[PDB]
Structure formats: C-alpha cells, structure tokens
Design a protein around this ligand. Structure first.
Ligand SMILES: CCCCC/C=C/C/C=C\CCCCCCCC(=O)O[C@H](COC(=O)CCCCCCCCCCCCCCC)COP(=O)(O)OCC[N+](C)(C)C
Ligand SMILES: CCCCC/C=C/C/C=C\CCCCCCCC(=O)O[C@H](COC(=O)CCCCCCCCCCCCCCC)COP(=O)(O)OCC[N+](C)(C)C
Ligand SMILES: CCCCC/C=C/C/C=C\CCCCCCCC(=O)O[C@H](COC(=O)CCCCCCCCCCCCCCC)COP(=O)(O)OCC[N+](C)(C)C
Ligand SMILES: CCCCC/C=C/C/C=C\CCCCCCCC(=O)O[C@H](COC(=O)CCCCCCCCCCCCCCC)COP(=O)(O)OCC[N+](C)(C)C
Ligand SMILES: CCCCC/C=C/C/C=C\CCCCCCCC(=O)O[C@H](COC(=O)CCCCCCCCCCCCCCC)COP(=O)(O)OCC[N+](C)(C)C
Ligand SMILES: CCCCC/C=C/C/C=C\CCCCCCCC(=O)O[C@H](COC(=O)CCCCCCCCCCCCCCC)COP(=O)(O)OCC[N+](C)(C)C
Ligand SMILES: *C/C=C(C)/C=C/C=C(C)/C=C/C1=C(C)CCCC1(C)C
Ligand SMILES: *C/C=C(C)/C=C/C=C(C)/C=C/C1=C(C)CCCC1(C)C
Ligand SMILES: *C/C=C(C)/C=C/C=C(C)/C=C/C1=C(C)CCCC1(C)C
Ligand SMILES: CCCCCCCCCCCCCCCC(=O)O
Ligand SMILES: CCCCCCCCCCCCCCCC(=O)O
Ligand SMILES: CCCCCCCCCCCCCCCC(=O)O
Ligand SMILES: CCCCCCCCCCCCCCCC(=O)O
Ligand SMILES: CCCCCCCCCCCCCCCC(=O)O
Ligand SMILES: CCCCCCCCCCCCCCCC(=O)O
Ligand SMILES: CCCCCCCCCCCCCCCC(=O)O
Ligand SMILES: CCCCCCCCCCCCCCCC(=O)O
Ligand SMILES: CCCCCCCCCCCCCCCC(=O)O
Ligand SMILES: CCCCCCCCCCCCCCCC(=O)O
Ligand SMILES: CCCCCCCCCCCCCCCC(=O)O
Ligand SMILES: CCCCCCCCCCCCCCCC(=O)O
Ligand SMILES: CCCCCCCCCCCCCCCC(=O)O
Ligand SMILES: CCCCCCCCCCCCCCCC(=O)O
Lengths: 259, 259, 259
C-alpha cells in the first residue's frame, strides 16, 4: 500500500486483514502456474502455423494481434505470482497487487476485449477498449471509497459497462452468421464467458463488504482466482481454437466466409 | 490523496482546503453532463456517414481515429463526475481527481493533439503526442513541488511546450492552404482554441498559489471547468464539423484538395 | 515519495539518505544535457533525408518509428533534469524520480527494444516490448521489497528477462546475414550494448544494498548515469547510423539486402 503497513506484531485478530495467508498464497501460486502455463502453450502453438494443418505463414511470421491471448495469460500469471509473494509475506507488503481491488485489471481487461474484437472483426476497437478501461477505473474507485459515494462510482461504472455489453451483443449477433459451424460453436462459448461471467463481477460487489456484507475478503480472493482462470485462461483457449478453426476453413481449405 | 485525508472534524477554517464544496460539486456535475453529452453526440454523428449528405462508408465502418474527439469528451465528462463525487463528499476523499493538479490531463491532452494531427494530416504524430504528455507531467510536478524548484519544473515544462507550439504553428501554416474555405474557417477557430487557450494554463500558474498568489484554489477549479469546456468540448465540435465539411467536399462532391 | 519525506532538520547522519546531494545533482544535470542534446541531434538528422546523401523522402516525411531513438533520449534527458532538481533540493522531494528504483525505466526500456526491433525487422514486436515492461516492473518490486521476497521478485524478473534475451539473440542471428558489412559493424556494437550492458543491471543488484551490500546508493546513482548514457544515448547513435547506412545502400544506391 501507499500508506498502510502490516504492524510488526501482525494484523490485530478479527481485523479485516486477519485472513488465512498461507491458504491464499497457495491458491495464488497454483493459479500463477496454470494461467502462465496456458499462455506459454498459446504462444508456442501460434508459431506452429495456420490451422490444424499448420500451414506456413506467407510472412514466415504470425500476426502480432494473435499474440494478445497468450500475452494476457502470461501477464495475469505473473501478477498471480506477485500476489502469492505478498500473501506468503503476510499481506500489506509495500508492493502489493492484493491491496487495491481491481487495480491489476486496469491493464488486462482492455486487452481481452481487443483480442475478442480482432478475432471476430468487430468494428470500433478503440471505442470498446477505452470503455472497458474506464469501467475498470470505476471499479477501483468503488472499492477504494468508504462512503455512500461508493454507490455513485458503481453507477458511473455501470454507465460504461452496460452500454458496452449491449453494443457488443449487437455486434456479435452481426458476425455470428458469417462463420462456419465449428467456429459458431466456439464463439457461443466465448459469449458465455463474456456475457455470462463478466456481469458476475458487478454482481458480487452487491454482496461484498462494500454492499450487503455477505462475502468476506478472503472468499473474494478465492472467487477471483477462479474467475481469472475462466476469463483469462479458458477465454484464451477459446480464442486460440476459434482462430485455428477459422484458418483451417479459409486458409487451409480456401473456403469463403458467409459474409 | 496518497497520504493526506480530511480530518473527521472537517478541514480547519481558513486552511487551504476550506472551500465551498457544494458549489464546486454542482459545477463539476453540470460540466460532467455537458462534456459527456457532447461526446455522445459526436460518436452518434460519426456513425451516420460521411459529410452532411451522410454517404455510407465503403467499409460500412467509420475510421477508428475519428472516434478520438468523442472519446476524449466521454473521458473528460466521466472524470468530472468523479470530481463532483469527491467535492460533494467534502474533498480529500481517497480516490480524488481533484487533489493532484493536472494529473488527470496526462491522459486526455495527448489525445487532443493526436486528434488534431490526424484531422489535419500534420506529420510526426508520435513526436507531438509525447511532447504534450511530457509537458503535462512537468505541470503535475510544478503543482506538487512546494520549494523554489517549482519554477525549475515550470521552465522544464516550457522547454517542451513552447517548442511544440511553434512547430505546430509552422505545420498548420503548411496545411491551411490545402483546404477549401469552409474548412479554412473551422480550422481558424480550432487554432484560436489551441494557440489561444492552451497558453492560458501556464499563464494562470504565475498568478496561482504557486506564483503571485492572486488566484485561489476554489477559483482555479471553476476556471478549469470552463477551460475544459472549451478545450475538450468546443474543440471536439470544431474537429467534427471540420471533417464533415472536408468529406462533403472530397467524398460527397469528389473535389480535390489544393495540396 | 508517497509516504516518506525529508525531515526539516535534514536526514540523520549515516542514515541511508545521507548522500552527497550537490555531487549527485551535478552529475544528473550534465547527464540531462548530454542525453537530451543527443536526442535533439537525432531528430534533427532524421528530418534531413535518407542516408548520408540526404535523399528526400517520397512522403516528404520521415517514418514515425524512426523518431523513437531520438524521443527516448529526449525523455531520458528530461527525467535526468527532474532527478537533478530532486537532488539539489536535498532528496526525498514529493515528486522524486530518484526514490523508487527503476520506476522511471518502465516507460523507456520497452521503447528501446521496440526501436531495435523496427530497425532490424525483428518479428513479434508486441511480445518483446511487453516482456521488457514486465521485467522492469519486477525490478521495481525487487527494490521496493525489504524482505527475503525481494529474491522472489528477482527470480520472477529473470523468468522474463533471460527468455527474452535468448530469443532476441536468436532473432538477431537470423537478421545479421541479411545486411551489408557497414551495417553488420554497427549491429555488432548495438549487440554489445544490449547483450553486454543490459545484463549488468541484474548483476549489480547482487552487490547492491538488496544483496551483498558492497555498493552504496550514492554509487548506484552514479553508475546508472553512466549506464543510461550508454544504453540510451550511444545506443541511439548506433540505431541512427545503422539506418543511415542501410538507406545509403538500399535507397540511395538501390542495392538489395541478402535476405
Ligand atoms: C510484477 C508484475 C507486473 C505488474 C504490472 C502492473 C503494474 C503494477 C502496479 C503496482 C501496484 C502497487 C501499488 C504501489 C504501491 O502501493 O506503493 C509503493 C510500492 O511500490 C513502489 O515501489 C512504487 C511503485 C508503484 C507505482 C505506482 C502504481 C501505479 C499503478 C499503475 C509503496 O511503497 P513506499 O516505499 O512509498 O512505502 C509506502 C509507505 N508504507 C511503507 C508505510 C506503506
Ligand atoms: C478449454 C477451453 C476451450 C476448449 C477448446 C476446444 C477444443 C477444440 C476441439 C478440437 O478440435 O481440438 C483439436 C485438438 O488439437 C490440438 O491441438 C490438441 C490440443 C493440444 C494442447 C491443448 C492445450 C494444452 C494445455 C497446456 C497449457 C496449460 C498448462 C497449464 C499449466
Ligand atoms: C473514474 C474516471 C476514470 C479515470 C481514469 C484516470 C485515472 C485515474 C487516476 C487516479 C487518481 C487518484 C490517485 C490515487 C490516490 O490518490 O491514492 C489512493 C486511492 O486510489 C486507489 O484506490 C489506488 C489506485 C490509484 C492508482 C495510482 C494512480 C496513478 C495515476 C496514473 C489512496 O488510497 P489508500 O487506500 O492508499 O489510502 C491513502 C491513505 N490515506 C487514506 C490516509 C490518505
Ligand atoms: C460549437 C463549436 C463549433 C461549432 C461548429 C460550427 C457549425 C458548422 C456550421 C454548419 O453548417 O452546421 C450544419 C448543421 O448541421 C448539423 O448537423 C446541425 C447540428 C446538429 C447538432 C449539433 C450538436 C448537438 C448538441 C448535443 C450535444 C451536446 C449536449 C450537451 C448535454
Ligand atoms: C518530469 C519528467 C517526466 C516524467 C514522466 C514519467 C512519469 C513520472 C512518474 C512519477 C514518479 C513520482 C511518484 C509519485 C509520488 O511519489 O507521489 C506524489 C507526488 O507526485 C504527485 O504530485 C502525484 C503524481 C504521481 C502519480 C503517480 C505515479 C505513478 C507512476 C506511473 C506524492 O505527493 P503527495 O502530495 O501525496 O505527498 C506525499 C506525502 N508526503 C509529503 C508526506 C511524502
Ligand atoms: C557514438 C556511438 C556510435 C557511433 C556511430 C559511428 C559513426 C558512423 C561512421 C560514419 O561513417 O559516420 C559518418 C559521419 O557523418 C556524419 O553525419 C557526421 C556526424 C555528425 C554529428 C554526429 C553527432 C553530433 C553530436 C551532437 C549531439 C550530442 C550533443 C550532446 C550535448
Ligand atoms: C479478468 C477480469 C475481468 C474481466 C474483470 C471485470 C470486471 C468488471 C466487469 C467490473 C465491473 C464493475 C464492478 C466490479 C463494480 C463497479 C461497476 C462495474 C460494472 C464497472
Ligand atoms: C484539456 C486541458 C489542457 C489542454 C491543458 C493544458 C495544460 C498546459 C498547456 C499546461 C502547461 C504548463 C503548466 C500549467 C505549468 C508548467 C509548464 C507548462 C507549460 C507545461
Ligand atoms: C535504460 C535502462 C535499462 C536498459 C535498464 C534495464 C534494466 C534491467 C535489465 C533490469 C533487470 C532486472 C533487475 C535490475 C532486477 C530484477 C530482475 C531483472 C532481470 C528484471
Ligand atoms: C519459465 C520461462 C519459460 C519461457 C518460455 C517462453 C515461451 C514463449 C512461447 C514462444 C513460442 C515460440
Ligand atoms: C445512485 C448513487 C448513490 C449516490 C451516492 C452519493 C450519496 C451520498 C449520501
Ligand atoms: C456523466 C458521465 C457519463 C458516462 C458516459 C458513458 C459512455 C459509455 C458508453 C460507450 C460504450 C460503447 C462502446 C462501443 C460502442 C460501439 O462501438 O458502437
Ligand atoms: C460464489 C459466491 C460465494 C460467496 C460466499 C460468501 C460466504 C463467505 C464469505
Ligand atoms: C448514459 C449512457 C448512454 C450510453 C450511450 C453511448 C452512445 C455512444 C455513441 C454510439 C453511436 C452509435
Ligand atoms: C529558472 C528556474 C528557477 C530555479 C529553481 C531552483 C532554485 C532554488 C533556489
Ligand atoms: C534538459 C531537457 C531538455 C528538454 C528537451 C525539449 C525537447 C522538446 C521539443 C520537441 C517538441 C517538438 C514536437 C514536434 C516537432 C516536429 O514534429 O517537427
Ligand atoms: C471559442 C472558440 C471557437 C468559437 C466557435 C465559433 C465557430 C463558428 C463556425
Ligand atoms: C480569469 C482569472 C480570474 C482570477 C480570479 C482571482 C481572484 C479570486 C481568487
Ligand atoms: C531547449 C529546447 C530546444 C527544442 C528543439 C527541438 C528540436 C527537435 C528536432 C526537430 C528537427 C526538425
Ligand atoms: C528463489 C527465490 C527466493 C524466495 C524468497 C521467499 C522466501 C522467504 C523466506
Ligand atoms: C509464473 C510466471 C511465469 C512467467 C512467464 C515468463 C514468460 C516470459 C518469456 C517470454 C519472452 C519472449 C519474448 C519474445 C519471444 C519471441 O518473440 O519469440
Ligand atoms: C560502447 C559500445 C559502442 C561503441 C561504439 C563504437 C562504434 C564505432 C563504429
Ligand atoms: C562498477 C561497480 C562499482 C561498485 C562500487 C562499490 C563501492 C562503493 C559503494
């Protein structure tokens, strides 16, 4: 933290920072390995060529944007390693990626939507990416604010998040009929992640310590490990296989989209 | 702030933070709505097509860079909402966009000059955008520094700001003769904003509490609301209409620039 | 700093912040001028045309990416000016670019590798630039962390830094045979800077106050001034002359690469 520190005696018992630090560090360490591990495979696989047939790129190089899926996993995995270091040191360490909720998401979530946009040829990538960015800053503010104005930041966040989700549904509906069936099946599941799991984050806030107070900070850390596995890693596998299926169809078999 | 906080008793009377917080929150709330409102219209209008005749894009998509004007207004408006939240909570709230002068401009001002550069086909966009960025960081430092070194940061800021303003005048003089008369008229007014209102910010510093001490913090907050309306929103309307007039000429009427 | 401040009495004698502040400010001021000075020349020279013969660009504009070398020097020089201001004010000033080791490198080092990548036509520029970025954040954490976990952040940093150095060697080996001999000679020396001086930073950590404790903070500030002169300014001159020699060969003499 910028200001706070763990007392040398340790956090007081029952305080909000009296959590199970070895348990949380363990979960973060395992999450670090799985997510980074998945990112490595994604980048490895991209360099093998186009589609399942692994047809050589004409450039001899894979396209830069295709790396985004794998990179985001490498980034998120690295951040989970840092988070484990903080937890195994007992929390509140100077360089804590655990302390400011959602602060770490300000970098990765705009990359996710950009990746989705390039993969699907959704228009107005600049508009979507900045929208996610601003939304995440609203979440940071909502967790950082102790007063009733935390609800004001929530609503400000929803003014970006809900419009952008509805626009994206609209866009995705337009693209979906373009693609062959095996791509349609992977795009369905990518949609379940985006339109199904992204709304859970604002839903959880309502039961958090900033809302009804039904979910503790410890539980929240565990729940986000799992949500990060789905929204970064599984999501990444879906984008990767979506592209392999597309390339198999268009590049390796030379068939046209139903555009 | 990172360190400071409002006492629970409130700020001491006559302290520098003893301002009229309901007045400032009111002005920020209204500024939030006007500026974001203008951004929404800008994006709406862009999607209607090219020029006044609203001729369909060949891509079926407007160009990404054209969104910059509208996005900057959405961003600035959102930041004014946050600023109102801070003021209505009584100032010094943890997540304050009011506390560090010019910190919020570090994102938006480079976007403004990029927008201007793309709209006018000014060369070396990377050089201009980083120049503005660095200049704004010098302003942040100048307001953050209590000693006589605040003048050192001012001068460092002027080493970027004055060179870049003189280069931009030179560039603008080169483009101005290229364009048809209705574009020339809107470009004149865009220049009045850039070369006329941007210098006011460093001019105001000299009379601020970091200079002669003639202008208070409360007054400064009000003055910047107005300057933000001109430099983001009006500026945004000028870029938008400039493009509509250009496209009417080149795209809808198929006439050539005097290049 | 976010939290700490110099006592008004001054730092206590023998404390870690009891350094020779006029000496450090002097060295930073001189470094500011040389590095920024070199950046100015680089940008000036770029605008003169292609190669030694200064053949006009067909666009009438030099390519944006070519500005990166010069810009990085302007940026690094500006940061050295700020660093001098902090040192001449006696250290620990609110806006200190001296306080958080490596924090200032988080912006400039990714620009260096991008510049190198574009200059040499190395593939996967996104992968290299983010790799450097993440590595530098690991260094920031390693210096910021007082516990034995500083070694954990070091190792995390090495998981990015060593892979990316080995990949880059591999890539550079592929390009080297493409280019004419005078380019080969400048590329050799660019490699001595990258593969020879970049490893020194992690090597120095081991003898720093975060390792064996053989090198003081004062010495570290001086050593980095020199390393910054080599890794930004000299490196910048090498990229510039490499391009002039390439353009003389391909553009002004119209000979083909051995691709
Ligand atoms: C590794 C994996 C890669 C991750 C990439 C993403 C970005 C990382 C974001 C950083 C999050 C940590 C927030 C920074 C922080 O929380 O602050 C600093 C640590 O980081 C420091 O070295 C200062 C550097 C922090 C820079 C400010 C963060 C801006 C966020 C963007 C705090 O140290 P101080 O010495 O002032 O002591 C503070 C005073 N105490 C000891 C009494 C609390
Ligand atoms: C999970 C999320 C989405 C699942 C995608 C659906 C698979 C597509 C069906 C198919 O036809 O897959 C063909 C399998 O070919 C292939 O390369 C076979 C797959 C090869 C390897 C697949 C991933 C390897 C996992 C290693 C990375 C994670 C390590 C963590 C530590
Ligand atoms: C919404 C609209 C969108 C805006 C986009 C633009 C960027 C926003 C810039 C943030 C400006 C606020 C500066 C951050 C701050 O000022 O610091 C933190 C709040 O923000 C926190 O959640 C920590 C997050 C701050 C990250 C650091 C700011 C870097 C600037 C770039 C401070 O909270 P702490 O718990 O450490 O308590 C500090 C100790 N007290 C309570 C005794 C003062
Ligand atoms: C102000 C700054 C610059 C003014 C631009 C000059 C106008 C160009 C003259 C012209 O020929 O405008 C043709 C008007 O066509 C049109 O679309 C008519 C204009 C339609 C709407 C114009 C803006 C609507 C405002 C709504 C957004 C702000 C809401 C804030 C809350
Ligand atoms: C000039 C050359 C250009 C450089 C471009 C590169 C980026 C600069 C990076 C900034 C590094 C400085 C770190 C910020 C800092 O260290 O923090 C603030 C100063 O900067 C402030 O105005 C607040 C602004 C700091 C924003 C946070 C830094 C994020 C890093 C990215 C601290 O001021 P406060 O009033 O809270 O008093 C703190 C409380 N005391 C007085 C008891 C210590
Ligand atoms: C040093 C690092 C790398 C050295 C590059 C090797 C030179 C190439 C040999 C050659 O053939 O250079 C031809 C010299 O032409 C030319 O423009 C002659 C060079 C003209 C000026 C060279 C740099 C001027 C320095 C001013 C900027 C620094 C000022 C700091 C204050
Ligand atoms: C990889 C992690 C992801 C996709 C995280 C996403 C987070 C959100 C969609 C957060 C949204 C919001 C809150 C948690 C509270 C404030 C209001 C929202 C909607 C911006
Ligand atoms: C939308 C807001 C804008 C365009 C703000 C611009 C701000 C500046 C041009 C500031 C300049 C400087 C100071 C206020 C003081 C330090 C020196 C300058 C020239 C960098
Ligand atoms: C212009 C300055 C440059 C090129 C600085 C580079 C810095 C590094 C290569 C730093 C590396 C690391 C440490 C200093 C400690 C943590 C581990 C590393 C390898 C990330
Ligand atoms: C632990 C470090 C492992 C680093 C390996 C990084 C591999 C990235 C994929 C490249 C594919 C060719
Ligand atoms: C709707 C958002 C709730 C407003 C929060 C601010 C009001 C504080 C009393
Ligand atoms: C007072 C502040 C109001 C906040 C303004 C909210 C604006 C956010 C909505 C825009 C998101 C849309 C993203 C893509 C749209 C598209 O591509 O069609
Ligand atoms: C999934 C949601 C789980 C919430 C758990 C709340 C009880 C523990 C705190
Ligand atoms: C308050 C929320 C309003 C959100 C509306 C965002 C509209 C952006 C312009 C899109 C034009 C098609
Ligand atoms: C010209 C800039 C003013 C220099 C400020 C530093 C001097 C402090 C005494
Ligand atoms: C000691 C530090 C000195 C600071 C160096 C100041 C350099 C800034 C001037 C460059 C801005 C020019 C922007 C565009 C120029 C162009 O496109 O021709
Ligand atoms: C104030 C600056 C801009 C003024 C807008 C008037 C433009 C009319 C066409
Ligand atoms: C426009 C400038 C107005 C400055 C006002 C100064 C007096 C009030 C503080
Ligand atoms: C001190 C300020 C000097 C500013 C001069 C910036 C020059 C940048 C190179 C432009 C070449 C044409
Ligand atoms: C290998 C890295 C060293 C691990 C640091 C954490 C252990 C603390 C006791
Ligand atoms: C638990 C965290 C593990 C950290 C993961 C380390 C991954 C970094 C290695 C990738 C760097 C490679 C850069 C370019 C590679 C290429 O272009 O071929
Ligand atoms: C020190 C590294 C670079 C040395 C520069 C010598 C290059 C001569 C051509
Ligand atoms: C080059 C390395 C120099 C280290 C100097 C250590 C002694 C002074 C601290």
């Amino acid at each position: 933290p910028f200001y706070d520190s763990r007392p040398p005696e340790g956090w007081p018992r029952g305080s909000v920072n009296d959590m199970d630090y070895p348990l949380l560090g363990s979960i973060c360490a395992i999450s670090a390995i799985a997510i980074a591990g998945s990112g490595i495979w994604m980048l490895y696989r991209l360099d093998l060529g186009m589609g399942y047939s692994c047809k050589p790129y004409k450039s001899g190089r894979a396209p830069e944007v295709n790396s985004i899926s794998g990179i985001v996993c490498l980034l998120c995995g690295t951040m989970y390693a840092a988070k484990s270091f903080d937890f195994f040191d007992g929390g509140g360490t100077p360089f804590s990626l655990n302390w400011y909720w959602y602060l770490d998401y300000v970098f990765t979530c705009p990359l996710l939507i950009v990746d989705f946009a390039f993969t699907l040829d959704i228009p107005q990538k600049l508009r979507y990416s900045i929208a996610v960015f601003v939304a995440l800053w609203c979440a940071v503010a909502a967790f950082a604010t102790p007063s009733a104005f935390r609800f004001a930041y929530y609503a400000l966040g929803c003014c970006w998040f809900i419009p952008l989700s509805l626009f994206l549904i609209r866009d995705v509906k337009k693209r979906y009929q373009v693609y062959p069936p095996k791509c349609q099946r992977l795009l369905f599941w990518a949609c379940v992640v985006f339109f199904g799991f992204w709304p859970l984050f604002p839903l959880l806030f309502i039961f958090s310590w900033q809302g009804s107070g039904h979910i503790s900070r410890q539980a929240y850390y565990i729940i986000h490990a799992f949500l990060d596995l789905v929204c970064k890693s599984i999501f990444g596998f879906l984008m990767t296989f979506f592209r392999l299926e597309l390339e198999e169809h268009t590049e390796v078999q030379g068939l046209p989209l139903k555009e």
